[PDB]
C-alpha cells in the first residue's frame, strides 16, 4: 500500500467521515451540557496514627449519627418526566425548588423487592399540596402535620412554582449510609502527619457542606468522649462532568470509528475500479462511459452530454475495430443484468445513424426487452412472431422517431426463447438485413444468466461485452469471456460503463 | 489467507453461529436467574496485634460456642424435587417458609458413610405435621415435644403453606463448624490498625446477621475473661451470582466455540468449490448446474427452471464441442454414484429433443438403472435382453411420453454386466442407431466403482464426466480422467453439478 | 530515496520555508515581548517536622487571615481595550497607575453565574472620578466616602494620568484564597531540616513581597499562640516569560512544520518531472519548451526568445522525423486542454515559414478555437462553413500579417463538430492543400475530452502529442497514446511544454 491511496480514500469518503464525526460530537456536547453538575466540598482536620481514624470516620456509627441528625433518609427529588428535563431546566435558567421535611413516615409495604416506599407531591400553591402514593389522593397544608391513611408527613417552607412535582422516598437507613459512604473520602495527604483531608461530592453545593460539617462535628464530639482546622467549603466549579475531555474523547472516537468503517469498506470492495484491471487480464477496453446525471434516447434528448461524447469515442474506435470482420453485425452483451447493454446499444445506434449510415437495431432480449417502449412502438409483430413463423421479414421493422435508424422489437414474450433463437429463420433474417443496412446492432440478455447471447454470437461478426463500473468484477468478466469462447464466439473486447470520478484513482 | 475469505465463511455459517451463541446465552441466563442468591453481612471491631486474633476468631472454640448457642447443627431445607424448583419458586414470588426447631435428636445410625441422620417433615396444617425417616410414618403437633421411635423433636412456629416439605438433618458438630468457617472471613484492612472487618456470606439475610452478631459477642466475652464498632448488617444486594459477568462470559464463550467449530469445518473441507479448481489441473468445465429445489423429467415438469437453463447452456456448448467427433455418440459418466449422471443425461436429452433433433437415450447402467421408472416403462426387453441375444434391435426402443426422444432401458439385472457389455452386439447396436438418430446419449455407472464406462467409452465419440459440487474432490476427478485415458478413452471435459451460492466465493 | 533529492526539494521550496519560519518567529517574538512579566519573591523560615507545616501554611485559615489583612478581595485592574494594550504600554515606557482602596461594597447581585460584581472607574483628575456599574453613572471624590445606589467606596491616593480607567471587582473570599494558593509554594529544600522556603509569584514586585511578609507574620503569630530568617524579597529578573526558550521553540516549530508541509507536497506530486519519465514508457520526447515569461505570436514579437529557440530545435528534429511520411500533414494534439497545442502549432508554423517554405495552418478545434483572434481575422467562412458546404476551398484561406503562412479559422461554432469532421470534404480539402503547400499543421482539441483528434488523425502523416510539464501525468499521456492507437492513428511522439528549472532535477 502507499500513502496516496489512503489519502484518496479519505477524500472520497469525506461526507461519511464528516457526518459520523459530527453526530458523535453532537452527542458528546449534549451529554456534557445536560449531565448534572457534581460539586465537591472539602475539610481539613488535625490528628493530635491516622491509619485507624480513616476507618473510624467511615464506620457506620459516625455516618449513622450524621444521617439521623440531618434526616438524610428522606429523599426529595424534583420531578421531570424525561431524561433531559433537569438539564434543560437548568440551561433555561429555571431555579430549582426545595421542601424542608422534618418528619416522614410511609406505610412501609416492605415486600420482597420494593423496600423503599415513595409518594408524589404536587405543589398547588405556597401553602397546600396534593399527595398520591398508589392512586390514593390526599390534600395537605404546610404547617399542620398530616396523619392519614397510614402516612405521616410534616412539610415546611415549600419553595417552587405551583404545578411542580416532587418524589418523596423513605429509603432504609443502611441505604442512606451506603450512599453517603460512596461519595465520602478520607485521605492523609502526608502519610505521616496528623492532617486528614475529608472530601464529599454531591449535586447540592450547600447540602454537602452541611453534611461534611455534621460529619466533622460528630467525629470531634465522639473523640473527646482532634482539631478542626478547615471547616468544609464547596468548590463552586463542578468536578464532573469535565466538558472539555468529554468533547475531545467524543471527537476522537468519531474519527477512529469513521476510519475503521472506511478501511472496512475499502477492504471489502471487489468491483472494477479502472480499465487497467481489465487490461491486466488481456481484455481490450474500447471505451469508458460516464454516468449521465441528466423513455427517451440520451443521444437525442441531450446530444451534447458527456456520455454521448464517450459513445462517439466508442463509435470512432469501432469504425477501426470492425474492419476485416466477416459481416456488419455487432452484438452487445454483458455479464449481469442492468449493466448498460440496451443503453449502450441504442445510443450507439443513434450516434452512428446521425452520420448518414443506415442502421438496424434488433432487440434479441426476448425475455425482458423494453426497446419498443423507448422508441415508440406498435408492439405487434416483433422478433418472436417472426421466429415462430407468424410474421414476415418486412412487418417487423419500424422506425425510431427522434432517431434515424430502424428497429425490431422483441414482440410477445415466448415460452421458449432460447429454442426460438436457434431456428434458421434468425440467420435468414440477419443475412437479408446484412444487404439493406450498413450496420446491425443486436441487444442480448446477459450470458451468466441465460445462453441466448451465445446462440446469437455465432452469426455476429463483432461481439463486445459491457461491464458496469462498480457492480461487476474482473472474475465475472473473465468467466463471461471464457463462456463465450467455449461456445465458439470470439469477444473483441469490453466496454466499461457507469464510470464516476474518484480521488483515489 | 485473506480477510475476505474469513468474512465470507462467517457469513455462510451464520445460522450455526447464531444458534450456538443463542443456546449458550440462554443457558447463561437460566443459570443467572435460577442460581440461589448469596448475601453478605459485615461487622467492624476494634483491637485495643491483630495477627493472632484472626486465628483466635476462626478457632473451633469460638465457632463451636456460636453453633451451640444458635443450634446451627439442625439443618432445615425447603424441599423442591428438581434442581430448578427453588429458583422457579423464588421467581414466581412465592414466600419461603421456615420452622423454629429448638431440640432435635435422631437415632444416629452412624454407619460407615452416612454420619448425618435426616428426616422429612410434611406440613399438613398450621399445627400438626407428618414425619418420615426411613418409611416409618409418625404424626406430630407443634408445642408438645415428641419422643418416639428413638426420635426426639420440638417444633415451634411453622410458617409455610400446607403440603410443604422440609428436610431436617442433624449434621455432626465438626461439619457445622467447617461449614461456618468456610463462609467466614476476617481481614485487617489496614495491616497495622486495630480495625478488623468480619465478613459472613449466606443465603438467609437475617440468619447470617444473627450468626455474625453471636460470633462477635462470643469473641468479645471471651477476650474480657476489643470493641464492637459496627454490629453486623447485611447488604441487601446479593454478592453472587453476578448476573452481568455471567451473561457476558456465556456470550463470549458461545462466540469462541462457534468460531472454533467454523474454522475446524473450513479446514476439513476437500470437495470441489469452484470450476477453477478443476481448470487448474487442465479439465475443461463445460457447465455448472445449480440445485433444483423444485419420477418425472425436470426439463418437462418445469421447463423454466434455473437448472434447465444451465442445461441449455451446456447444450449450446456441446453443439460446438461435439463437432469433428468420430460419431454422434455422447457418454456421460462420473467418479462416484449419485453425482448426477442420469439427471444430466436425461434432462440434456430432453432439451436437445425439444429443438427438433431425433435423440436416443441408452441406460447402460445394467446394475442400478432406473431410467425406465422415470420415463414410463414396459420393463421387458431392455439392453440386457438384447445383449444376451434374446431380443431384437427394434423391440427394445420405447418412447418417452412427455419427452420427445426414444430410450432403451437396462432390462433385467444380469449376473455378468461387464461381460455382456463386451459383446460385439453392443457395437452393432450403436452402429445401427448412429444412422437413424441425430444424437445418442449413454448413461453409465461410475468409473471408480466398476469398469463398464471404460468398455462403453471405446465406441463413444464424446465422453464427459460429472462431478458433484461438494461431494467429489479434485483428486477423484483426476483419478477418473487418468483411469479413462489408461483404457484408451479420451475425456472431453467435466460438468460440475449441484452448485449452490456461497458468500465465500 | 537519496540525500540529493531531499536537498534539491528543500532548495526549490526555500521561499515557502523561509516565509513560514519567519511568520512563526515573528509570532514568538511578539508573544515574548508582549506577555506580562511575572516576578517571584522568596522567604526562608526555620522550623524549631515540617511535613504538617506545609499543609498548615496552605490552609485556608492562614491565607484567609492574610487576605482579610491586606484586602486582597478588591481586584483593581488597569483598563486596556485590546489583548496587547498592556504590553504596548509597558514597552512604550508608560508608568502604570494605581489606586489604594480601603473599603469596597458592591450591591452583590449574586445571580446564578456572575458571583463577582464589578464597576469601572474613570479618572478625570487627581481628585474626582466617575463610576459606572451597569450604565448607572456616578461621580466621586477622593477622601470622602461614597454610599450611593447600594454602592460603598473609599478611594485613596490615585496615581494615574487623567482619562485612565480601572476595573474594580469584588471577588468572593474563597476565590481570592484560591488565587493566592495557586501561586504560593512551600518547600523543605533539605527534606529533613527545619528550613522552609516560601515562594510567591505575581506581576506586582512590591505587592507580592508585602503578601509573603504578611503570610509569614501570620504563621509566626499563629504558631506562638518558628523563626523568620530571610524576609521575603523579590527577584528583579522575571521568571516568566522565558524569552529565549520561547523564541527557540518558535523557530524549531516553524522549521518542523515547514519540513512536514514540504514532504507532504512532494509525496503528493503526480505530474511529469522530466522527459525521462515519458521515455521510460517508450514515448519519444522530441522537445522540451520552457515557459516564456515575456493576441500575438511569440515567434514574431520576440523571435530571440528561449521558447522560440526550443521550437527551432523541434523544427530541425521534425525535418528528420517527418521523412518517409505518407504526406506532409502534421497534427498536434494533446491529452488535456490548455496544454499548449495552439501555442506549439502556431509558433512552429511561424518558425517553419521564416525558412522559406509555404505553410498552411488549420484550426480544427471547432469548439474553442481562437486562432483567428491571434492572427487577425475576418471571422466569416471558416472550416465549419466549408465542411457544412456553404463555402469554397479558396474563400476560407487567409494570411497571417506578421507571420508568413496562410491559415484556416474554425468559423462559427457548429452544433455537430465531430460529425462535420467526418465528411469527405475534409479529406478533399487536405488532398487539395497537400499539393499547394510544403507543410500543413492541424490544431485539434484534446483526445481525452472529445474524439475529433482521432477522426482527423486518419489523414495526418505525422501526429504529435503535447504534454504540459507539471499538469499532465504519465498515466494521462499513456492513455492518450493508447486511445489514439485504438482508433488507427500512430503517434510519433510527445512534446513536453511549459518546463521550468528545478534544483531537484
Ligand atoms: N452510463 C449510464 N448513464 C445513465 N443511465 C444509464 C447508464 N447506463 C445504463 N443506464 C440506465 O440505467 C438502466 C439500466 O440499464 P439497461 O441497459 O437498460 O439494462 P441491461 O444492461 O440489463 O440491458 C437503464 O434505465 C439505463 O437507461
Ligand atoms: N442439480 C440437481 N438438482 C436436483 N436434483 C438432482 C440434481 N442432480 C441430481 N439430482 C437428483 O438427486 C438423485 C441422484 O442423482 P442421479 O443422477 O440419479 O445418480 P447417479 O449419478 O448415480 O446416476 C437423483 O434423484 C436426481 O434426480
Ligand atoms: N511555454 C508557454 N510559455 C508561455 N505561454 C504559454 C506556454 N504554453 C502555453 N502558453 C500560453 O498559456 C495559454 C494556454 O495554452 P493554449 O495552447 O492556448 O491551450 P490549448 O492547449 O488547450 O490549446 C495560452 O494563452 C498560451 O499562450
Ligand atoms: Mg437489456
Ligand atoms: Mg445413474
Ligand atoms: Mg487550443
PDB file of C-alpha atoms and ligand atoms in Angstrom, chain B residues 337-343 345 363 365 368-371 443-446, ligand 5:
ATOM      1  CA  UNK B 337     -22.505 -42.741  -7.636  1.00  0.00           C
ATOM      2  CA  UNK B 338     -25.270 -40.199  -7.070  1.00  0.00           C
ATOM      3  CA  UNK B 339     -23.279 -37.483  -8.826  1.00  0.00           C
ATOM      4  CA  UNK B 340     -25.965 -36.603 -11.353  1.00  0.00           C
ATOM      5  CA  UNK B 341     -25.230 -38.703 -14.427  1.00  0.00           C
ATOM      6  CA  UNK B 342     -28.822 -39.790 -15.022  1.00  0.00           C
ATOM      7  CA  UNK B 343     -30.208 -36.359 -14.153  1.00  0.00           C
ATOM      8  CA  UNK B 345     -28.184 -37.203 -19.331  1.00  0.00           C
ATOM      9  CA  UNK B 363     -29.405 -46.718 -19.981  1.00  0.00           C
ATOM     10  CA  UNK B 365     -26.206 -48.794 -16.096  1.00  0.00           C
ATOM     11  CA  UNK B 368     -28.828 -49.838 -10.750  1.00  0.00           C
ATOM     12  CA  UNK B 369     -30.560 -48.195 -13.709  1.00  0.00           C
ATOM     13  CA  UNK B 370     -33.941 -46.572 -13.015  1.00  0.00           C
ATOM     14  CA  UNK B 371     -34.495 -44.645 -16.264  1.00  0.00           C
ATOM     15  CA  UNK B 443     -25.715 -43.243 -19.219  1.00  0.00           C
ATOM     16  CA  UNK B 444     -23.132 -45.333 -17.387  1.00  0.00           C
ATOM     17  CA  UNK B 445     -22.180 -46.379 -13.858  1.00  0.00           C
ATOM     18  CA  UNK B 446     -19.261 -44.627 -12.148  1.00  0.00           C
TER      19      UNK B 446
HETATM   20 MG1  LIG D   5     -27.354 -43.444 -12.617  1.00  0.00          MG
END
